[PDB]
């Protein structure tokens, strides 16, 4: 528009407000208040290592050494848990000590930030699969329809346009949430796409958030250690729908394809209207009457409430079709036109580090995913089965810590669904890479003792299903040969980490991107055409030796 | 040009033992050799 390259100004209003107004706005009974509330509030924080002069510094902990740190800094409020007197050890400013800093922390932040979620289209999205992809597509669609959009996830933070505020740890407290919320509110943005993470809704956060649209894309059973019973999983995840209070400015997007869609709806204000997406279940408001998925082509004739529309794109993935269905249903909730929905859908061609298709003049689809669980590789393998290519190669990473129970079943599904498998050393920050490669096969039926007795005689084995064995450690050569395998129209997965733009091997840290190396290898395919005999299993790349 | 068979895998095709006495090798193998970096191929193995 104006510049499109210079950074947009950090237009943050420095809030001016006093402690008595704070107590009146959010009436919390004091237990350890002294003196008088003669203090001007200048900022807000929770952690002493980020506490500056004049912030809230609220977090539940007893006998903390951070009290002295905040006293040195000069925080306006210094309240962890402990009854502490004034003018001797905490003479920096006044005290407003509350019973539970976590309970009133969203309340105090909203009162200080003037409750910015009321003046925004704050959308929380629940579910298990495709959360980040759904957030990306929804934010692109919302930005397309003539209005700015924000982003509140655990992987990235898009303030507006294309600048990315550095993504912090999985979930900080509500102080950072409301700080970035103020940035959205006063930086030209008028909406935000918030991921309703389990830790977010568990840690007393959604009490002081006004949700405009609540979306339920897909359901799956994971992290069952935290959700000890399926009832807790179905109720805690239903807190997103329970926050709904106004069935005239708020809408419900539900997945009747999943079994518990009415169950999710019934957990609070069913009057808020239900708009449903489902592909296999044609009894939905938005449904792709025609569905076609290929390795490089994808066609969807979808009968939205507006009408029947054709969507053609190379963004593969059946769950990606489900996600696009959820996005168009969300657009229907706000009454957005189909043309703007298509513009938003096509506004993204490669979501960062997930399902990132690379086509640098080649017929083998390079694709990566987060792949922090074996079920992610299993799901991508089922998608590949649904999108049957000629030859299947999947480069398998490793496991960081001592979670040795995943790689057996991971290698099982890989070798069962891939003609040729491949392994590498992606994340092994715990032990030696050789031991990590040894652990890769630990539960399914083949023993690596043969890897001991190679002697130029075991290089040509056909594992259980006649498929091919695989072993390597040098990540660069591993991915180079993985891209170098692709002959014509085969499957070339080099996944395992996703958007992780580095590489760790026990005690190392350097720059390493999988996508960049993949496109570089696609470029050197021209040099690769000069040779390439003895291609199938092992070894590779060296001619004039037969 | 010796080929050390060792712990590291041998993704490079075949092994070879040694062959460097022909005057043609000054510019014959460079077309087949390297082709992807210098240290990432020559220094991995085939030491002299």
Automatic annotation (TrEMBL), chain A:
State any single GO MF term: ATP binding
Tell me where in this chain the Mur ligase C-terminal domain is found. Answer: 353-498
* A GO-annotated cellular component: chloroplast
Q: Which UniProt keywords apply?
A: Ligase
Question: Which GO terms fall under biological process for this protein?
Answer: cell division; chloroplast organization; regulation of cell shape
All copies of the Mur ligase central domain together span 125-330
The entry's family comment says: Belongs to the MurCDEF family. MurE subfamily.
How is the subunit organization of this protein annotated in UniProt?
Component of the plastid-encoded plastid RNA polymerase (PEP) complex.
Report the protein name in the record. Answer: UDP-N-acetylmuramoyl-L-alanyl-D-glutamate--2,6-diaminopimelate ligase MurE homolog, chloroplastic
To which species is this protein native? Answer: Spinacia oleracea (Spinach)
